[model samples]
Target: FQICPKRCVCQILSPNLATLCAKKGLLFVPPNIDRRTVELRLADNFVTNIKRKDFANMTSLVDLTLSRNTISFITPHAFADLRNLRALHLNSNRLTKITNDMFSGLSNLHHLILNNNQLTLISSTAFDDVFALEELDLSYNNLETIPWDAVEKMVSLHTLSLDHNMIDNIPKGTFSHLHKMTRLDVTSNKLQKLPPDPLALSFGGNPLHCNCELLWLRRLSREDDLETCASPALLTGRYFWSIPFLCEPPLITRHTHEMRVLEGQRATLRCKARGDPEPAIHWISPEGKLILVYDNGTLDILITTVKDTGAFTCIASNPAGEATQTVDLH
Candidate 1:
């Protein structure tokens, strides 16, 4: 160990030792970190904020860990200086929302460890710059749902860990554009059924409803297990591989029969359904346009007018059959 910062030891990692500014009473990032330091460990600290200029000279950082900190806020682009950073660990922090500009310049960042944080919102454009990001760990967080819109652009993403959350449903096509995804871990959550074609998936400890919708899962279970059902009393605790099936047509579980809206305003129409496979949704606008959405659909009228006033219908379909619901807009 060499001369260190804040009574923390500078330990060994690569050619030279790395910076270890861990264990707290150290309330903020130390100012004297060597510019050439390749790895930095600021874990177990009480660093509540990360200002933009904190690591302005650490362009050599390839690995950084800020785990177990009380960091609830980080200045936008605080890590812009670490252009070569490959893995950045921010687990067990108090970060509630992932703002789009927070990770603006981490172009080469690969693995983002954000498990065990208080993440409730992820900006839809948060991953716009980190196109090469491969693995995103979001396990043990407080996310009640997956932010599909945010990570959908991570084309190189391979593994997405979302276990131990409170997700209820996964709309189909949520990951359809992510072609390189190899693993999706959604175990230990609140799921009723799965959308079709889950990637090399592991969904144990979920309350998966065993119905025709999950017929696609049986083929996977012929080789993989550790999954069980939470519905259809007979199959409640049974291994999902042994789940029996009786097909039924899809049906919209929620509905809004009528909607009154003002012209020159915006409105949202949502259609959610249930059945075997959950079901794909398609929307028919008053203008006679058919919009297809997987598992569920949401139609947004950017600016409503008399031309938009009419019946809006949502069709839910699966292999077994189909169901339709209509909402009147006036």
Candidate 2:
């Protein structure tokens, strides 16, 4: 049996070794740990900084827990030799920034928890070497934007938690490469809109602004009670769908007033309107039949006949109101 560090306990379990140096008020990683130790628990300590090669001899270390520490700085290559490390916990620390190359040698690392830290900025290259990382917890931080480039390279990432941050908006293409992402938590943020994706996302407890911009959310197939309005005075505390999206009446910019076409000849009637929330355009034939041209704001008459020689009406409408224009065909 190897000599353990003073005041620390070392246990040898079959197929794995465990070292406990937690709550010792230690200022640094203790020396003289067993070489074959696979798990190291250093939680609830006063370790302020991690220098390079601190664990150089512990090449076999796999699980490392440094939670609840005063860790404010981590030198580059601090975890250089632990190539087999799988899980690292740095939660509840004083880390205000994540610099590039901070985790440079952690190629095979899988799970990383950095929650409850003072992290305000994460350099784009901070996660460059953690390519194989799967689960990342960045909740309860002061991050205002997603580290798009770095996170986009995490092709193997599965779960990402960004809850309780100060994110205001998720720009388009921010999560485009997260094809394998299953769960994304953005709750308790200041987001006004979410990136359109099929991931199982959580947006509860956020101050979501309800407007025509969020009209697409109505088509999403999720639980109705999952989201609530956080803006527009009267809409607050109400379900997201409860808000009546109002828009100005459609304004006709162009229309065909009258048309004279020969029998059996094809004729076309065009009408264009603009409005907030974009009104839907429709046409009424001489026989009072409503013809819906849902594709565009234009109408086409395949063949002109005696039945087409009458008054045709073009109508544009939205939640606010509707507008109509009549054109006679002779």
Candidate 3:
């Protein structure tokens, strides 16, 4: 620890102006500090409480580590001045509850680790303002349910960890807004059902109850090579009929055909599809295509002309199968 001139210590840990400090034998956050430092580590310290003003001057701080301490309480604005902070670690503490605004001023935060604590309840909007956050870890806590809106503000989040908790149910659309999220870990938690939506990209390891509702999620896991906590045999025995459905991919069937037209005339094209899981449509052309042309469904060509005639084809595919249509005009 870098001992400062007064009652605190500030050591430059990296070339990026990051600092590591410890209040020597102090029971609270140290006061008075420069704001240019971008990182702060305060591990193995005697800090017991935190006040908003304790971090008022550290405006440029990006990472803060306050683990392995006796901290029991913190003011909502304890970190209000650190707008550039990107990561925060608060593990191995004696906290029972946290204020919703305790993480204020952390708009650019990307990761937050809070494992190995006695946290009982997290406020609904605890992360309502952390728009740029990408990862969050809250394992080894006492949570019994998922906080649907606790992370609603984290639109850019890609990963979330909530293992070793007491959660039982996963609410519908609980993660609907997390379109960009890719990973979610809920292993060792009590979960009875899974969320819906096959297009939603996600990966999770959970002790799923293997029920009807989890049919789609199970399929996604197997397709994406996601790890699962429960054994496949166990799941099959619990949900015999649904087990097969869970392993099957979404149904999709489509076909496309090409059309030709005379110079300066209009041309028409058609596409058809049928499946349990509808497939999207796309079109392609021949002529040393420079750019990859793409479409949602069916394609058309206007004006019958020599330039509009060629061996055209349509291709359609879904999780279950693939089909194509072709036509040539002279």
Candidate 4:
């Protein structure tokens, strides 16, 4: 029953103090909001941008909802002083990118909702300061890839939503930093295969190519009902586990069959193989020592003495099968 701002209503709901100023045809944040407000609702507004110190005076604010707005720009330190803030809703906006330090002072934030925006780019250091973040929703955006480095630092993150994006591939070690992650939603995208992890994941509505490359997924426990194949026309509408995992064995196409080199001369052995899922190549030295092994199809060696003259074996292997080629050096 206190003096309220024009076009705004202030209410006290006991543990939930709030100020409702939504759909007011406002182009900027209203001035003189009560300092003790715990929740602020500015949804369905025409506010197109948020500059630094916009909410700096709201030290006691915890829940802020800015959904369904035309906000396209957020200056650095916009929410700098809202250290007690817990949840932020910025969904359904026009933000195209998120830069580092844009959320500089929101250290205690827990839930962050940034879905349904035009966000295609996010700086690698954008989430460096949000160490307390637990849930993040970045679904329905134009992002083609995940900001691995920035996401990796969110040690407290448990649930992540990336559904309905243009992501085609996930690089190796991308989720290595998410030790506490438990659930991931990646439905409806251009992914061909699932990333390496035993966590609960949703891959429905993706163009998942069913091939030998995905054989490993058959053994992992997942939400089978929500996982289906979208590629390989014959396997359409079939659950991922129901599809037969088939692949051809590695085939060595080219290799140095024989070579003649003098002492102290550098000698190289080349081996190339082709197969589904790409066979892992390994080189075994003359002394029965494992020289090198990798997913690459080639391996190089520097010959230093006559002792290097022996039969070098190249082994290429995958879940389907294995192939070997021997090259004699003298």
Candidate 5:
């Protein structure tokens, strides 16, 4: 039953809610609160630090908001016992470091907002126990680099935010461990190169240095919506390749007069073609019909019925030269 001070006005926003206090110069949590209340809003305040006892008796609270504040330090156990909390707001603050176990007992937490902060380092155990967490927004932060080990353990994480950070060089195999991740936003980072491997599983919008090493990845990504996060000026188109596996010239094997094949299986149809620049590949049926679709290079046909048991041809041609090979599938 604590009453508001003379300078501040406490108005009952709803029937069960007692007060909504406003002050022009006051900072920090209000001196009096109905511990049984379920919702609290303290936006636009100059709160610099939050003590563990700030919400000591609010065990029934489900939502807590402290946005648009000047919060600089968050105690490790500041929200320790708020076990049933589902949503939290800390969007606009000056939080630099989140102490270990800062979110220890928030098991049911589903949405967390920490955008527009100066956070440089985040501890692995800060949100370690929050198994049910689904969405986290840490956008507009001042993070330079992220620890690969800390982020790999969040198996249940689906949406991760890495936008507006100073990240450039991500360690090799950094994202190879994220198995369940479907969407990742690294659009605004300092990335200059990509890891050497198949990146069909990962989606990024960061500027990638277009070098020969990244040729295979860029070529594969062409069919996907994923694009270079950084601008084109950063990528000098050095190692850029439009496709994978067929980058260099083809190798020649000893020309055999007799074709090889298994009794039931089909043998690889050899099509050799040489040109100044390798030409695209496609297959035509004996009826003189284009059976297989046009592809960059290398095409194979499987035997479905006994009628498909016959000689096939692999036609290879380029601007400089042309060659062909034939095999039988029986």
Candidate 6:
């Protein structure tokens, strides 16, 4: 029988050990815990910080729950020794940012719950060590954007819950690496719009701006998935699909009018535009060749010599209307 903390409960069923420590009025992690403990619960306490050697000998620890605590800081690689750790619950804490090397040795960590925290920034490489993570919960935080750089590494992730944040937009192709993602929850956020041809996404409480840019949403045809408008007056508090005039004509908001490139220089020509249903833009060459570009309407001219000096055309269109603009490159 291994020794245990005087104020904590130690359940040792032969080699399987569990240490339960909660609401003990402890200011920090208690001492004298067995090194072979597999599960440790220290949630709902006043623990403010975690030292690096707190679990140095608990190499066999697997499940660790530190939720509902005032833990604002944790030493880097604090869980480095827990190579067998699988589930880590750090929800309802005061942790703000995820620093680099914070999760250094947690390669096999599959389930991570950091919801209801004060996280505003996540270092691009914070999750570099957590490659096998399957389920992630980052809801109810202060995140303004998706951590695509860190998320792209977790290729085995299945479900990602991100509700109740302050995200405004999810750019195109943000989830191309998350091929195994089945359910992505973004129900409550500051999103005003979504990318074109989105999959099973809804802005239930988002104040979407109703216009021609959203005409594709109307074609989605599921009346129950319609989002309400919150802009341009008159249309406020109205479901976008219930109105027609809101789908205005496509207009070229930005485009390259004219340019005189330096001899044999590389330059990118932009023909950006805005509408309710996002306009698909393409370019036409001076040789009368129709060059179909992406919906972003930007064309790159690499190593333009005297022979390429000519006018190029950019066309943007949607269900509402089509817009054409020409750029002269000399």
- Cα lDDT computed for each candidate against the true fold: 0.79, 0.80, 0.65, 0.79, 0.61, 0.79
Candidate 2, residue 144: lDDT:
90
The TM-scores, one per candidate, come to: 0.72, 0.70, 0.61, 0.76, 0.59, 0.74
Question: Higher-TM-score candidate among 1 and 5?
Answer: 1
Worst 10 residues of 6 by lDDT: 240-249
Q: Tens digit of lDDT per residue, candidate 1, span 152-247?
A: 778889999999887888878788778999888888888878887555787786877777667676656354457776655536565544545656
Instruction: After superposing candidate 4 on the true structure, give the runs of residues whose Cα lies further than 4 Å from its correct spot.
Output: 1-7, 12-17, 147-158, 168-183, 195-201, 211-227, 230-237, 240-244, 256-270, 288-296, 300-311, 328-330
Estimate the TM-score for candidate 5: 0.59
Best by the TM-score measure: 4
Ranking by lDDT: 2, 1, 6, 4, 3, 5
What's each prediction's clash count? 2, 0, 14, 0, 16, 8
Badly placed stretches (over 4 Å) of model 6 are 197-202, 221-226, 231-235, 238-240, 243-330
The worst-scoring run of ten residues by lDDT in candidate 4 lies at 291-300
Clashes of 4: 0
Instruction: Name the runs in model 1 displaced over 4 angstroms.
Output: 1-3, 11-17, 146-156, 174-182, 198-200, 221-225, 232-235, 241-244, 250-318, 322-330
lDDT of 2 by residue, 1-330 (tens): 355788688787787888999998899987677767899999999999997756877778999999999999998777878889999999999999988878878988999899999888988888888878899999999989757777877888888899998888776766677678888888988887666654477878676666565656765667754676655453566544553644456888888868766787657778889876577888888767664254677766566778668888888887668998988888
Q: lDDT tens digits, residues 49-129, model 3? A: 887687787767878888888888888787877778888888888888766787776778898888888888877667776
Order of candidates by TM-score, top first? Answer: 4, 6, 1, 2, 3, 5
What is the Cα-based TM-score of model 6?
0.74
lDDT score at residue 237, model 2, on the 0-100 scale: 64
Clashing pairs in 4: none
Cα-based RMSD of candidate 5: 13.9
lDDT of 6 by residue, 1-330 (tens): 347888897787878989999877778887677888899999888888989868887788889989999999999878888899899999999999988877778977999999999989888778888888999999989998756777877788988888888888877767678788777777778877677844645467677766656657766666465456765753566564455536546688887758888875667888878875677887788867664244467776667778767888888777778888888977
Clashes of 3: 14
lDDT of 5 by residue, 218-238 (tens): 555345444542323333333
